[PDB]
Amino acid sequence: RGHKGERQRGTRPRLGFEGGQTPFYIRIPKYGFNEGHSFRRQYKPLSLNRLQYLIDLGRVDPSQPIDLTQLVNGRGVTIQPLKRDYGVQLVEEGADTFTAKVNIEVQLASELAIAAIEKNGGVVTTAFYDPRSLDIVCKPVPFFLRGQPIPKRMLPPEELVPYYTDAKNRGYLADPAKFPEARLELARKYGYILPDITKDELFKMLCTRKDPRQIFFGLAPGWVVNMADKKILKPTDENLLKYYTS
Amino acid sequence: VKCTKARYLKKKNMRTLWINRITAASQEHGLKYPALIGNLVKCQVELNRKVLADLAIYEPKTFKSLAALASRRRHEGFAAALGDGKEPEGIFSRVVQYH
């Protein structure tokens, strides 16, 4: 401890105290770097290098739709709904050398990543998930042990409705009548001839979307999955059906 | 602590004890101590103080002959450094060169 002072006695002052002059961490103006930090939305990146990597090693099956559950179960992307991740964003890294016909549902996507998927005969759409809904999507099995009926996912807030209703970034609430113009525009911009998805055999697979207010793929809101004896209990009351099919 | 600092003083006090005994024994033959030690070095007799003190006590004829060799060398030092210039060196004054 050294010689007898205040640091030997055990009573050195708090961290940051500069002995009486105004401390470093207080001489400096407050600025809002971290002002609304816990309400900003976060999106884990998934590069196309990463997703080609998952498709090559059998971890993500591209002959099925790639929802967010399939990226979690292949352990391609770890997303945590606390710490307010709102899902995955596709990332243009590895756009050259991306050779996969795929159907991904990713909450944000850059133009060049949409171009790299849609070049190869792919489909991208950008869905939205509530924190509740996203949390049920990522780890679905600890939700079906919770006993609750499947809820309906909520529509975006007003900041994000102009995002998911645009056909340029492939919104899930946008027209399916404005999509060929946008696919045609990217195909003209980045110099590839736009293949028609209608011709090949995976088309019925490459067309499937779940509508808004549907969290899982083949299921519906209001159903109660009985994991134990492998059943699905469905409600038949009219008030519940007005509430769940809203 | 005294026990370890006394190693230095053991060596020191033995040496002054030997110089006292060589001094006494060489004063018996008229020499002084600096004369004896100097003019035995100058004869290439490199005996040390312990041995000279022990010869002084136990072998006083060898010690008398060493005092005779040292006083003879001392006089050749005198006579050599008196008649200066090129001359024959002293008999006991000669050195044995080692190569």
């Binding site: - | 044995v96 060169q97 080692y98 190569h99």
Partner: protein
């Protein structure tokens, strides 16, 4: 203030009297110095302590060979009060690889390359 001392150049210019005193020739001078520390670096400034460490004279009464070039002479001029300098004279040649082990530097300043322990 106590400072580092420059020494003028007239101090290091020999006179023919000095060539009569010591054994030197101004033409054909000696190549190697023998330097020995004969005084302590304690109570001396830190720069002299350093120069003693550079010249390799940390132990006293131990000879060290140096070159007689102006750089080494500059360092020697800084600590010339702590050392002793003599010319390395070589009566026989510098030692070949045959005579490399059997040498001895004598007190005179000469380095003999055949060191028996027999009398002549």
């Amino acid at each position: 203030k106590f400072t580092r001392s420059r020494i003028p150049e007239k101090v290091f210019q020999a006179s023919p009297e000095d060539h009569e005193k010591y054994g030197g020739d101004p033409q054909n001078p000696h190549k190697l110095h023998i330097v020995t520390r004969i005084k302590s670096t304690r109570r001396r400034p830190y720069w002299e302590k350093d120069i003693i460490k550079m010249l390799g004279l940390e132990k006293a009464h131990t000879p060290q060979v140096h070159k007689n070039i102006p750089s080494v002479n500059a360092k020697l001029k800084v600590v010339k009060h702590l050392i002793r300098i003599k010319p390395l004279k070589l009566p026989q040649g510098l030692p070949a690889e045959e005579n490399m082990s059997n040498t001895c530097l004598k007190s005179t300043g000469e380095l003999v390359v055949q060191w028996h322990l027999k009398p002549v």
